Amino acid sequence: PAIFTHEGKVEGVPGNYPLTAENLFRIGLALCTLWILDKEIEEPTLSIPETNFVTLALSVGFMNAGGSVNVGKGGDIKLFLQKGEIYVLEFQPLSETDIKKLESILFGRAIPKKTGEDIGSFKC
Amino acid sequence: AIFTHEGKVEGVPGNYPLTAENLFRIGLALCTLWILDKEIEEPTLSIPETNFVTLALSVGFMNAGGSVNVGKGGDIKLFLQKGEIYVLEFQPLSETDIKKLESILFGRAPIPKKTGEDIGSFKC
Numbered sequence: 001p002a003i004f005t006h007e008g009k010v011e012g013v014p015g016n017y018p019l020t021a022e023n024l025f026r027i028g029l030a031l032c033t034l035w036i037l038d039k040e041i042e043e044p045t046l047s048i049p050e051t052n053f054v055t056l057a058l059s060v061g062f063m064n065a066g067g068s069v070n071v072g073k074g075g076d077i078k079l080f081l082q083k084g085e086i087y088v089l090e091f092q093p094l095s096e097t098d099i100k101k102l103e104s105i106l107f108g109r110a111i112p113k114k115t116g117e118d119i120g121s122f123k124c
Numbered sequence: 125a126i127f128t129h130e131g132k133v134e135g136v137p138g139n140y141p142l143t144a145e146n147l148f149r150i151g152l153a154l155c156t157l158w159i160l161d162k163e164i165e166e167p168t169l170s171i172p173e174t175n176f177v178t179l180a181l182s183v184g185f186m187n188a189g190g191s192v193n194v195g196k197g198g199d200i201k202l203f204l205q206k207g208e209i210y211v212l213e214f215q216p217l218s219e220t221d222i223k224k225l226e227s228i229l230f231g232r233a234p235i236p237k238k239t240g241e242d243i244g245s246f247k248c
Contacts, residue, residue: 015239021183025144051246053186056179060144063176071248085240115138116208122174124194124248 001099002107008094014054014087021057028061029113030105031091032120035076036066038101043068043120045075051124054087055079063120064113070123126150126229127222133212137177142210144180151184152235153225154214155244158199159189161224166191166244168198174248177210178202186244187237193247 003018004010010027012019018027028046035044044067048055051071058079059069069075080090094102105111114120126133126141133150135142141150151169158167167190171178174194181202182192192198203213228235238244 013240014243015187015237021148021187021237022145025148051248053183053243053246056186056246057183060176060180060183063179064138064144113138116136119137119176122176122179124174 001096001103004091004094004099004103006096006099008091008099010089010091011086013085014052019054019087021053024054024057025061025064026106026111028058028063028067029065029111030061030102031058031077032062032065032067033105033111034098034102038098039076041076042066044077045070047071047073047075047078049079049081054089055081058089059122063122065111066114066118066120068120068122073123127226131213131217131219131222134209136208137175137210142177144176147177147180148184148187149229149235150225151181151186152188152237153184153229154181154200155185155188155190156228156235157221157224161221162199164199167200168193170194170196170198170201172202172204177212178204181212182246186246188235189238189242189244191244191246196247 082088169185169192205211
């Protein structure tokens with residue numbers, strides 16, 4: 001993988017690539033899209049461990065594609081976060097093929113978005 | 125155009141001016157205005173609830189160094205009316221403030237962003 005490790009991890013300094021607001025927004029959009037198109041979960045759910053710039057930028061993208069987000073209450077996808085100077089995000093469950101599919105969407109030229117009430121929700 | 129004559133931002137969530145990117149930029153601009161124009165070093169934005177629109181704005185506000193909370197107080201408060209067309213209002217934002225926001229939102233150069241530990245926090 002290019003930015004994801006084989007373990008489904010992404011590392012960076014908050015605010016700098018690959019953790020810019022735009023990058024994270026696209027990662028969220030891509031993750032939700034992967035679940036909708038490849039796993040047939042029309043309204044995917046993402047569980048984040050806490051609320052900060054990194055997890056919320058991701059959440060915004062995930063919600064824009066139709067997925068809902070919650071803090072610490074399970075879901076189809078779970079995010080683990082190790083903080084510090086360099087953050088390490090860990091997404092589960094992701095096979096190496098899932099990651100390849102995810103990055104194909106992320107780096108592809110072709111991502112569909114929902115609008116209005118079709119956009120996902122967020123629960124603290 | 126982003127702001128109406130009444131100084132509000134309206135649209136369909138997800139679509140301009142309520143795209144994730146534009147809301148992010150409005151948040152970035154709001155925080156930047158408070159630091160540079162109002163000389164408030166650590167601006168605080170208060171949002172009414174957590175949804176796509178308010179969180180996209182929050183991510184931008186944090187990226188400029190400001191902090192955000194849900195329901196509590198702050199230097200700037202967001203008022204949101206929902207429906208087919210969402211309507212956003214900021215307080216105590218004046219028409220003069222709006223002109224300044226537009227000057228940098230439509231400026232020739234990008235709005236500066238903070239990174240790492242300089243990015244603000246979020247409190248549910």
